[PDB]
Amino acid sequence: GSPPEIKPFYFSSSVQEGQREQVICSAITGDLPLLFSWKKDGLIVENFKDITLVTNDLFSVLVISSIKPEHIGNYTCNLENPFGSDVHTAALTMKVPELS
């Protein structure tokens, strides 16, 4: 089989508190099934109230339904299959917080 090559994902460059984010972790090559693991600054992401994961054997979407300052940081997707692994980290930066 072939090892996976991750497709980079990135957060928006103008994140505002209370808005939403979605990023897709996926591979351009690599035999299925793929397995996905998400961490935010080394923490289990999904246990954040406002973070939901949508995961199948092909891709995993990380959803932040309401951005809060606690979500600022680095999000790492680790991807593997029986033949290799890959990883990508994307930083979430907040441009505008709650003001009113």
Numbering used by the authors: -1 to 98
What wording appears in the published article?
Recently, a shortened Dscam (sDscam) gene family with tandemly arrayed 5′ cassettes in Chelicerata species has been identified, which encodes ∼50–100 isoforms. Chelicerata sDscams could be classified into two subfamilies, sDscamα and sDscamβ, containing one and two variable Ig domains, respectively. Crystal structures and cell aggregation assays demonstrated that both α and β subfamilies of sDscam used Ig1 for the isoform-specific trans recognition in a hand-in-hand manner. Furthermore, the cis interactions were established by the three FNIII domains of sDscam, which assemble into a cross fold with a kink between FNIII2 and FNIII3.
To elucidate the molecular details of trans interactions of sDscam, we determined the crystal structures of Ig1 from Mesobuthus martensii sDscam isoforms α1, α7, and β6v2. We also determined the crystal structures of sDscam Ig1 from another chelicerate species Limulus polyphemus (isoforms α7 and β3v7) to provide insights into the conservation of sDscam trans recognition within Chelicerata. These crystal structures of Ig fragments were determined at 1.3–3.1 Å resolutions. The crystal structures of sDscam Ig1 from both M. martensii and L. polyphemus revealed a common assembly of antiparallel homodimer for both α and β subfamilies of sDscam. More interestingly, in some Ig1 crystal structures (M. martensii α1, α7, and L. polyphemus α7), the two protomers within a homodimer were related via a 2-fold symmetry axis, namely, these two protomers had identical conformations. This implied that the homophilic trans interactions of Ig1 were also symmetry-related. Similarly, sDscam Ig1 also employs the ABED face to form an antiparallel homodimer. However, among the seven Ig1 structures reported here, the complementary electrostatic potential surface pattern (negative in one end, neutral in the middle, and positive in the other end) has been only observed in the three β isoforms, but not in any one of the four α isoforms. Structural analysis showed that B and E strands constituted the core of ABED face and dominated the trans homophilic interactions of sDscam Ig1. The residue preceding the conserved B-strand cystine always interacts with its counterpart of the other protomer.
